[PDB]
Amino acid sequence: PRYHLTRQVTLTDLCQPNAERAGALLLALRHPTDLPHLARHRAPPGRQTERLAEAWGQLLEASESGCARAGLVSFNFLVAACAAAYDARDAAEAVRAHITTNYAGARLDRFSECLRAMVHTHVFPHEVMRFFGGLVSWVTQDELASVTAVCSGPQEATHTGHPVTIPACAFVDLDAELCLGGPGAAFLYLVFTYRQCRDQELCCVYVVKSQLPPRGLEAALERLFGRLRITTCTYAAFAELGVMPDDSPRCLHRTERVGVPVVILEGVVWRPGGWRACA
Amino acid sequence: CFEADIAIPSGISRPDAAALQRCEGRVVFLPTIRRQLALADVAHESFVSGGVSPDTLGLLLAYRRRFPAVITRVLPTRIVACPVDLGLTHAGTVNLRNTSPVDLCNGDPVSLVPPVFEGQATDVRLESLDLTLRFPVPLPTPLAREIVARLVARGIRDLNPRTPGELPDLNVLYYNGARLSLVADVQQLASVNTELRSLVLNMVYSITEGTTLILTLIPRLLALSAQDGYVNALLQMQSVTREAAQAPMLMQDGERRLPLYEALVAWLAHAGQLGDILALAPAVRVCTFDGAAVVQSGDMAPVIRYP
Amino acid sequence: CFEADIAIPSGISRPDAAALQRCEGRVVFLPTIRRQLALADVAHESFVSGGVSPDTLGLLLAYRRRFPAVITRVLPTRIVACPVDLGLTHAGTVNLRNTSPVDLCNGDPVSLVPPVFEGQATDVRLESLDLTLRFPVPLPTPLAREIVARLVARGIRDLNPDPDLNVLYYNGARLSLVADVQQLASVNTELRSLVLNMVYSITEGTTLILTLIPRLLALGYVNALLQMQSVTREAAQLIHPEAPMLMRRLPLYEALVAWLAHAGQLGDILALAPAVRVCTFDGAAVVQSGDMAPVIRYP
Amino acid sequence: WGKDHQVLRLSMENAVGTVCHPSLMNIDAAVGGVNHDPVEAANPYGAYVAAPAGPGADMQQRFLNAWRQRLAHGRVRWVAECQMTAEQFMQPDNANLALELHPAFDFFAGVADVELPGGEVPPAGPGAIQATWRVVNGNLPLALCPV
Amino acid sequence: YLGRGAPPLLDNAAAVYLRNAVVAGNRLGPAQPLPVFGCAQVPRRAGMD
Amino acid sequence: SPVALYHQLKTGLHPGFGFTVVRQDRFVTENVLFSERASEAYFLGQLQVARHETGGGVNFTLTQPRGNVDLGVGYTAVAATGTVRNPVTDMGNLPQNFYLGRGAPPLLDNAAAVYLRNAVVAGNRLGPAQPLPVFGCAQVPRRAGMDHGQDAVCEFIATPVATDINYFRRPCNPRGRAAGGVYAGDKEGDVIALMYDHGQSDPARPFAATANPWASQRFSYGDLLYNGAYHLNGASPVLSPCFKFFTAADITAKHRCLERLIVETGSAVSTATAASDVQFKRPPGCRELVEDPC
Amino acid sequence: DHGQSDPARPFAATANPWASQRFSYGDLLYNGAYHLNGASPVLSPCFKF
Amino acid sequence: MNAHFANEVQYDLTRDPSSPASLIHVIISSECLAAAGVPLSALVRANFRVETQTRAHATGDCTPWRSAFAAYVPADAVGAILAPVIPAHPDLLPRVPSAGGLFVSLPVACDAQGVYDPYTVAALRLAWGPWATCARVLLFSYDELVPPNTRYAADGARLMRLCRHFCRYVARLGAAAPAAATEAAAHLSLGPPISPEEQLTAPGGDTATAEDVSITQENEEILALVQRRSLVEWLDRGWEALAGGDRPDWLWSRRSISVVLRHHYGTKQRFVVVSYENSVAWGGRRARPPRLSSELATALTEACAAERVVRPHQLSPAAQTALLRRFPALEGPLRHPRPVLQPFDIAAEVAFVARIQIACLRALGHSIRAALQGGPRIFQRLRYDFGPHQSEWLGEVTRRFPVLLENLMRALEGTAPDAFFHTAYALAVLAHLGGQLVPLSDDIPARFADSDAHYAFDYYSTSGDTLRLTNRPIAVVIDEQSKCRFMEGPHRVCEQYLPGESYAYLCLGFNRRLCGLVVFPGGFAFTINTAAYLSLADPVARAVGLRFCRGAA
């Protein structure tokens, strides 16, 4: 009812929202203790399915689940772990200087191996680490966590807009699509662009910028790419991060919390959307 | 609603102000999200591209990259439109006008189709503001998916001639009775070609490795034909399935991948999505509060969200 | 919200009254949205479409057709349900009853057929007025799309016989799909019509495309770009399938619409779109079978 | 003077960003827009190239007799050696005023359609108005560059 | 042929010969024929007296 | 060649001809408005707004309708102009860059033009870095400091050297011939006739026809650069001073009834912007309310 | 449209093929789109039909 | 690059066709186009359509026009395959420049167990636009096109220079190379510019080398008695780090490349014969064993070279039929009474054309005499009124008249026949020989085939020199009297007027009926029955039309 609260109790083995900002684009970790099984399934047999059986098992080594399940993944944890992967180096790598000095690359180094191992056996990182929200409160303990980081529509950026102002956490991120500029409202999405066996199972996390519908986004997902050179398949999944109902309030900064480039985005209808991955 | 207005820009033909009154509940394709916008991008002259007007398959592609909007209230100064793509958050269920020869149902998903009918052109003309208006025809979605397959395949017959001139017209439609004839006047090629390619390229990926085992059971299909009712009615007479009847190819690597289960996945990925990648997305659903089971031609039906 | 009332009919027993006490928080389907309704619009006997009992196809036609309603508070002489499909997005928190998987903190659960699980579980019958309330199963979007394609794949090996498809691990648990002793023999006769639908839409199109594309490209931007992204994929499928199978334009393009007409049916039939969301507050983020969950309105 | 008690300087090295664009050689619409409403036969002595024919020994007595006719007909396009400056700027006495358009080019009444390295006597008749190219700066006429 | 529960003929040459021999013009005759999901679509004529 | 003319000027040598400079200073002034007693109407209305509740209340605006007519049949209540505060955009040396926008077929010798690409746009204050994408502006860079004011644009038009200096000792038309829609006599064809038809003489300087035939005639080098129909610039947001002079439609688009002519001079909309470091051509959403006698 | 039957008699398309069809001999004579008759005073009674 | 590759996707078609085929990559350079009559500026203005058809030498028909591909790139066209250009790294391989042109691979007619037929011509056509003026035709025989073997020996020096230039690029640039590129350099060191023209001019080619192993095994044996992952896999990461992608265009620049020089029998020119390793085209090392056989190029030569028979119609009667007992497709060029194509000549396709140039001029020249037998009465046919002193202009036209009709026919002789087929009379006959089919370049409007009143003109200069003043056939619809009317519709001067409207114009129109007009200024015109003088034999004309018609869709 244009104001909501959500809560999930996890560890600070992940994000450590005390080390994060007030505004962070948190993911969950849905199906957290999953993927020894789907490592074996869903892949053609030339992928040697005994890789992710150890790969996530080295992740929680860096992080026993207990009663506080592994979850609440930060926005930082994918950018810096793919910083060595995608086509931005020493600028996306400034996100690694943000994490390891505030959060830890010990958990990144196990997970950057997962980002070459999850995508290896066709266990693609979309529909795992589902969207949760914008880190409203951080009522966490010392080594444990209790975060309210509301999902559920536009109210996350009104109740942090009548007061976290939604950073993009990298100037390389918030992909400035539509340089063909005009007035309107912004429509935000979460795309994982892949490269399968060309760049050896590439991982990518960035947000697009468009005044485009979901039907005007799929052909926009076929155009503007140079990573078509694959053949397996089902690359470039995306869901709706929702509407920023203003293109006027975007910004360009390098000040956060290590000087990391960052984009202020004030006022967002967080339509949670749905994923799609077929081609 | 997240209110969006379109003003009356310049002058009025005095009966044509009443023509804007009887368009309450229709749909405007405005290619933006504005707090105010001129009426110039509204009409079909904006639908016309550089030099050339779209065909009824190009208008599908023209209605692709624009935004539908519902006429809510009609002022002599403005027209308040509600942005369907975002502002469908209406427990008041903002109302639409059915301009269609089909009496629908209760509970139909409703998708929008350009005017292609033989007698429901929806042509209203403004001469003070020199503009032409084609309103889309809201229709039920299986009947909508029965139309778009006809018009592309009619343009598939625009590539190759070969056959004698007596072709099956693709111009007789069937809803419980109700013989419908549509318009076949012009078929622009690029609207056919780009629609044909995605019909090709999606049907490429919808075949996989474990898909091939299913092809063995094609003679198994006709074994059910002469021994039941359901199968024999399922098997169409104008089908290639009755024509193709007149094998593992071992290559077995590993055999723990579930090859038959993986076949139905990627087939559904692309051949399962063939109505919506060719046509417009349905977001309008029939929902009347009074318990009325159908909605008459010309009525004001209440409209709820995405199906 | 806009709470809608379903009228309790005449004389029921106390176990029929207690049957109404074991359903507080289930999912109910209804044809129209009249503010007063009766129980005659609710029962499984109200799902007859051709004079016989519906199958899992005949339910999933209606399960995508009519409207979900969730009973908040049970009553004598009435049934209060605050329906899902009315109201603005992410408002009007409602409460569900879990069935054997988790329903995690997210997942966007989907109503679907009973006989994909135990058939005479959740087929709760009223004894006095003699009607049957077969409540749908609320499964979340990944596993709901998973199990729907497995039994119809298991229907193939049950169709014309000569691995085992039924293990299907969850994140933690091992989900026993097979309820062997009396259900699986009823499975392959209650998904009976449905397997023919997944087959005939494959046998038609693949045997149509292999006489479409050779009839195309020479009858040119779509020509060379046909196998451009399909190099050694479609020509390899032309090498594999067209050899170990058999090989007309005016019936062909007549069959073009008809298959793709059946294709547009199945997309509305299959894939089980999300209707309601779990995104709770101050919970343990993990729901168990038989426990309530705060469930919010729109995906 | 600037917006002070301050001096400023404008060179012709100032003119680097304007004269050096590749639009100085962009005269497509010019030849097209002047082409309609044609010009008559302007007895094209200097507006036509002949390919050579025979030895050079008699080549005069070819061209002496070949242009015996359309040489005493009228005048050539240049008469401006007699014209002082701003006599070109005035509306009389320069019918070729509407033919001076580009600093880097020339519009003059030449032959119509016969390809140039060929023939001796061009078919006097309708005329054409095309281009040549001004090569060096001295080709500007002497009412625009004083002696 | 409005219904479909009956197991049909096994020979296809008799199957869609006897099917369209009756259905061909009936006032109750299923045109654009029986979907797996959907309705039989009874032909509504233009005027009824 | 344009390549040779790049190569003559940096050395310094007069390349056969000359130029002319058209630029735009801007001056903030304190005007004086006399009025007659009873001139306007200015009525009043009613005050209430309960608008959309935005969180913790809408907070209750109350707007009021009004309206006003010119209650007077003549030129009531007019105007003056007396002081010069400060010259907002500077008297400046800043040249014009034509490589700012895409307008022309390049050289076919592509080795040559890419040499001349950065040769011109080495370090202009109006020279972009990371040059033109398909759609969008050139993004003129920002210098670290600005002192005197907004920057000028010194656009150049080729002139023969052999004109009078007597012309340009007058407020004259820089194209070399009178062009505005004042002088025409309402015969429906004389407007373009004084513009391009050089059979007649100049309305301004009638003993001759033009002053620069390279700037005057149709399809001349002056006319090829800054015509609004050709639109060489249009990607580059740098305001042409010469756009105002060289437009076949816009001077012809004006009326000539004198009553409406002078009052538009009291409030015209410029093509310039007093909210930008250079003369950025006017953004389509803003007003300026200039005077502009030119 | 003889694909649909007669509303008066649903068990038949028409009762006459020679006049009731489009471009049939009845419509050739008596429809006013051709006006084979009429520059003439005598009222055709069948003009209304 | 890819135009050689995408035509192989059209070679991935055919399946089981009428005749099994091959494909030869042929790189025409600049002066072979320039000396042909191809304006190099207009194709420089990369995928481009080429209409191709193939023609037998002896007898028979031709192929219809096949839409092919092209890549016209001004560069070192040999050096661009050998030293390609990464967008970030254009100095990955510095080279020596060369000439350049269009990249077009061309298919080859073969047999079952293919023995290719020399002297038989595949005909190119570049279409700048629609018009026949925007068209040229090129000639290529298989003697010109097919070498016996390639020269992949030149590919041996190239590939190890590639590994040294990956050893050269990282050492110069240093740490600016990314993490995948700093590895694959030194993995090529543990294993001068590249001039691409030396791969043509160094005398080395292919050899079976089995005779060159036994000639070396019995050569190193005496020496012995007296004494008594690869580098190519590191080339992929060499490209995948410097480019960032796969690029199947560059994938065959790493594999075996033979670059063979040949020459053109029409204009003394040179061109290039190319075969990769992975090409399904000819000379590829992934192809179908039944390819070509150089047997006809050795049979009819040596049976005429050992017998010293200079022309094989002077071949001995047993020496004729014994070759016919060997190769049976030669009954055409040896035992046909009057083949419409000349047997055993180089210009047999050219002499096929020049007859048509001759036979129409006699059909012209004896028809001009026909309507002008004696003193004529022509009075007029159009409506053009005079001023009073304008009649004295026609006082010249009395005196001027008879010198024209020689010089028209002199100019009809004076044109090349290759330049005659772009004019109106050479296509109006094709509009009539298709009526005894749509002729080429589609210069014929949609309404020329409607009436006989739709004529189609050419325009010649009356005064000065008698020269043609058109590119376009200007089709003017003509109604005692009849006034003129145009049809419906890069800028040519004379194309604005009515026929015979003004002085200094001769107007000359023709029909599908092939009853033509000769229109003079002043209405003074007359029909000519050239249909009474066109003597074109249909079996002669049926090889004419099929090479000059286009099957309209």
Author numbering:
A (entry chain S): 106 to 168, 176 to 215, 220 to 279, 286 to 353, 416 to 441, 445 to 466
B (entry chain O): 5 to 165, 168 to 252, 258 to 318
C (entry chain K): 5 to 166, 174 to 230, 235 to 262, 267 to 318
D (entry chain I): 443 to 589
E (entry chain F): 1130 to 1178
F (entry chain I): 1032 to 1325
G (entry chain E): 1228 to 1276
H (entry chain k): 1 to 45, 54 to 199, 230 to 266, 355 to 562, 569 to 611, 618 to 627, 633 to 696
From the paper:
Here we show asymmetric reconstructions of herpes simplex virus 2 (HSV-2) B- (containing scaffold proteins inside, putative capsid assembly intermediate), C- (DNA-filled capsid, derived from the enveloped virion by using detergent treatment to remove viral membrane proteins and outer tegument proteins) and virion-capsids (enveloped intact virion) at 8.1, 9.0 and 10.2 Å respectively. The asymmetric reconstructions reveal a unique portal vertex in the context of the icosahedral capsid, including 1 portal, 11 pentons, 3 types of hexons (P, peripentonal; E, edge; C, center) with the hexameric rings formed by VP26s, 320 triplexes (Ta-Tf) and 12 pentagram-shaped capsid vertex specific component (CVSC) densities (composed of a UL17 monomer, a UL25 dimer and a UL36 dimer, presence in C- and virion-capsids). Radially colored representations of the three reconstructions reveal the dodecameric portal situated beneath one of the pentameric vertices; but, the density surrounding the portal displays a five-fold symmetrical assembly, highlighting the symmetry-mismatch structural features. The portal vertex of the capsid is a hub for protein-protein interactions that are important for capsid assembly and genome packaging.
When five-fold symmetry was imposed, the resolution of local reconstructions for the portal vertex in B-, C- and virion-capsids was improved to 4.05, 4.50 and 5.36 Å, respectively, albeit that the portal was five-fold averaged. The resulting density maps clearly reveal the polypeptide backbone, many bulky side chains, and atomic models of the portal vertex associated P-hexon (PVP-Hex), Ta and PVAT (not in B-capsid) from three capsids were built. Despite distinct organizations of the CVSC at the portal and penton vertices, the packaged dsDNA is visible in the C- and virion-capsids. In contrast to B-capsid, small tail-like density, previously named Portal Vertex Associated Tegument (PVAT), extends outwards from the portal vertex in the C- and virion-capsids, suggesting a possible role in genome retention and release. A comparison of asymmetric reconstructions of the portal vertex of the three capsids reveals notable differences in the position and morphology of the portal and PVAT. In contrast, five 10-nm-long coiled coils in the virion-capsid exhibit altered configurations to the counterparts in B-capsid to recruit the PVAT layers (UL25 C-domain), ensuring the retention of DNA. Interestingly a novel network of subunit contacts is observed between the portal and PV-Ta and varies each other in three capsids. Lying on the portal head, a novel five-fold symmetrical assembly comprising five copies of a well-resolved two-helix coiled coil (presumably being the fragment from the portal or pUL36) shows close contacts with PV-Ta.
